[PDB]
Amino acid sequence: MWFEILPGIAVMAACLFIPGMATAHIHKFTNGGKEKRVAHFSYQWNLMERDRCISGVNRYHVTKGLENID
Amino acid sequence: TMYIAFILSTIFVIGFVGFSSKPSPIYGGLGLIVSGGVGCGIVLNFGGSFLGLMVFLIYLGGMLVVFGYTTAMATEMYPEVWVSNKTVFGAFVSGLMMEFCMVYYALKEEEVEIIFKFNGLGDWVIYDTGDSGFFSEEAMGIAALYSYGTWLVIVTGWSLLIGVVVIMEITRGN
Amino acid sequence: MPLVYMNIIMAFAIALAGLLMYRSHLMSSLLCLEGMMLSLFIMSTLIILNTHFTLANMMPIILLVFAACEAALGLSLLVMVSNTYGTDYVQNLNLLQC
Amino acid sequence: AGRIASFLKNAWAKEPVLVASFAIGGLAIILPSLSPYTNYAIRINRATPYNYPVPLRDDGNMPDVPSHPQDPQGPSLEWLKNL
Amino acid sequence: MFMINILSLIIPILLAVAFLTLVERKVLGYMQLRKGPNVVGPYGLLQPIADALKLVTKEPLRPGTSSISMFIIAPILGLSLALTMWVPLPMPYPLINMNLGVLFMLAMSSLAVYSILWSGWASNSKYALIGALRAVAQTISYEVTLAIILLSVLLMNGSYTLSTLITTQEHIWMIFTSWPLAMMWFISTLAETNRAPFDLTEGESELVSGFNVEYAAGPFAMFFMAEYANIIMMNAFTAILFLGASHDPHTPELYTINFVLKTLALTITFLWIRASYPRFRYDQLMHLLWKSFLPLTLALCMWHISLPIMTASIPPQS
Amino acid sequence: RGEYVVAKLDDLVNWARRSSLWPMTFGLACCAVEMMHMAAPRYDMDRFGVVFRASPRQSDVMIVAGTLTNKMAPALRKVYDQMPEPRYVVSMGSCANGGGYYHYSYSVVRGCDRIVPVDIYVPGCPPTAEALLYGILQLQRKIKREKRLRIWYRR
Amino acid sequence: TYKFVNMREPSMDMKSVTDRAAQTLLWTELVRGLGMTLSYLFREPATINYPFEKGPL
Amino acid sequence: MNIMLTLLTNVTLASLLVLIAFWLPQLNAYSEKTSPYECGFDPMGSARLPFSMKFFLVAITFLLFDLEIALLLPLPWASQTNNLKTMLTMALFLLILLAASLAYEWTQKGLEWAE
């Protein structure tokens, strides 16, 4: 009886799950497999702008370690 | 994308011409809230995030909202329309053409002297180069209202309480 | 000065002209007053953010709240006038000529 | 005695919302002035380093300024670690 | 790719609204000893589709006394606001990451009151305007408690950033710290979406359908979609604000499952209120807001400003 | 040919229109209570997609449940006119059908079909809630066999 | 014989007044209504599958 | 700018839904069909029905309360000052003045929906 309401609830649940999962996976895809960098303040923005410049490929998320120079 | 603040400001002035030509007050209010939205966008492009969101929440969703609500009560039997008067069209057209002429002159000359001297070299040009650190300078300046602005809080709160008392005095109608 | 300032000051001038050149409705004039305040807010905000006058960041808040208090007062006056004459027409506000 | 107790009785019986609101507001007014932790909150706000701590030149006779971040001079946050 | 993100946010939300219609009908039916939609498709699963198809092929009677510009602008504004309310929501990671996300929601929802002020005015009929004015007054009056409750709750967050709510509620729900504000917030959200005993603008037995009398078929459907999107969005905001889910940065699907389940539970509670209570009178809900909710909200805002200071529990602003 | 596509589209639109038959509560007399009994849990008209609707602007079918008097007929025709199309009328009970017990009265219109076009005539005084439900399903089957797009394709 | 339907005066002591204050502030009878609807949600509906099932005559 | 694209998409899709919603159905309209709905009869226009000072007063009181709320919004950053006693004094001052405005409106009729 009451459990026949569950199909519509499951459809609603899938439709509501899609946005969050899609956002997370798009963020991973477009940021080098890592979380999309958060820049709430100008210091974080400057960190990302420095990251883009030193990557050589104009992408902040290409991280240069001690293998780049030292 | 190169010019964003200028389209926003031109639209701002266009909305000002629209509601200041004074059609029926509901369309004047619509023009005012369009102008307020584009102005909130203007100050968002300048780093004034809290100030622009204040414009939105309190001006467009408060003060306006109340204005349109009060117009919806004290209006005409047939609430007027923009088209109904040739005066509205004339005022709006004259304002639009004086906008267009002056923006064209400023864009192609960059040394207009209508009251003030102006140079449309850009709008990004005046921005300074620096880091604000780990905080929003605007938010720190506004949150100083409670530490630096004690006198300001005192007088503004008193004026708001007086405003409540005053509105209740005037509207009693006896 | 940059051309955004030009357009903001132009908006103030247009609101001033619209307020000074009346029509029948009182609400239209009050909306022109509100436009004048909004242009003042944006001009102040641009000047304050551009020069990084940090303590002056709160000035637009104060301007907004005080001008909205005045707008509430003007709305109450309009409502009283309308309850007198059924309309907010300024031509009914002429019985002080004598 | 009985007058204030009776007033509180009537208010609790007919306007519990106002009683709760006035009690909560009164405590919010009063309690901060008695808390030992208010000074701690002030100290935490003071110990948050938003700006760069631009140094000084030791003209001699500066025995209390550290020299190095890990010298036994200058304020310590050991108190904050256990709080 | 960001455009795909926008699309994969918007479209599933509209589908969730469509099937929320079915879920609400079934919950109401089973609380009323009946079934609800169980014929059109398996367990009524094709019923929202039947409703959407029938509506878009039904004649949209426009009033002869209607300013068509605003008559069509009001549904556009309503639906655009209802959709854009989801862009800062931190299903683990937001589409739009702002410092002032909840301020943005407050502003956007306060702009949504125009869709009633413009629909009632545009529809004319000289009577739907009065219902529109009542709805606008109710909406603006409950905006006060929404804003102040949000202000008091966020004094533990430290900012208006919604992602910080996840961090604030890592070890404990914010419900255990602000449950009175949670009840007042939930009822304010009930009142803002014109739901439950607060559905005065569309009283089925008070003014038939109020501001939505003249709207039919398509624009009525879009208004309905806007309202139900606002319902789900407000319940999502409530779940994120008060029932913060645990987040694993390497497994955000767990947070999404948690959040979706809690949002559905709160939405089912919204439908649960609809089936349990009579309707408030207009003056009665105005009295509730102005004389019951507002004093307690002011007192609790005072309390929540005092509390972090006197306990050295002020959150970071970063 | 291209008549197969038109037939499929007609089938789709007529399935959507009969799966969401939203009626208008025109309860004039005793027939009104058997119709809310068809509304009641035992028959549950909502399980067929037949909702409890509101102002004629969102109604698809008019149910004339009760005696129509001369004083009342102009209002019934007004709300019938205000229904958006497609719209249908079900006459429920003897009074609405042909006057009924009050057929020979000075103040009663003899059948609502003198005022509005009627699609289904549900007999009984009152028809049982099951009889009204049968009439509603019969109306649904009337909608299923409409050929509006096939009529248009051969015009 | 007759009976009064609404002729009970509420008790005015500490415990009763606190009971009514808690009922006012914590919405307990509203919770009872929610409980009644929740209990009805888990009951088998009285609907019959017309026309495959018919009302008894 | 991502947010601008998001707003453009939302507005565009809402307007497209209008266009399908308001042009796709088949129409056949006459005079008595689109007549204003008044439960089976015709409505009276009368003369400026939306009146009564109470509807305007609630709007004005909401406006003033909203202004004080605008004054309260900077509070989350205000608690980050070293001078916490002044900030607490001023925030509580603003809230007492809000409570005083509510109380003055309450006691002087104000919030009442009178006869």
Ligand SMILES: CCCCCCCCCCCCCCCCCC(=O)OC[C@H](COP(=O)([O-])OCC[N+](C)(C)C)OC(=O)CCCCCCCCCCCCCCCCC
């Ligand atoms: C050390 C601690 C210090 C801090 C202490 C803080 C205070 C603690 C005690 C206060 C408790 C009460 C808090 C406020 C409650 C509401 C206030 C109020 O006015 O109530 C009475 C008000 C008015 O009640 P009334 O009408 O009986 O009284 C009016 C005034 N008199 C008595 C004079 C007539 O009632 C309501 O608000 C009714 C709401 C209607 C809708 C009901 C919905 C039911 C379902 C709710 C489900 C749960 C909601 C949350 C879900 C989850 C969300 C995340």
Ligand code: SF4
């Ligand atoms: S047909 Fe019979 S039951 Fe129905 S309204 Fe007429 S008299 Fe009453």
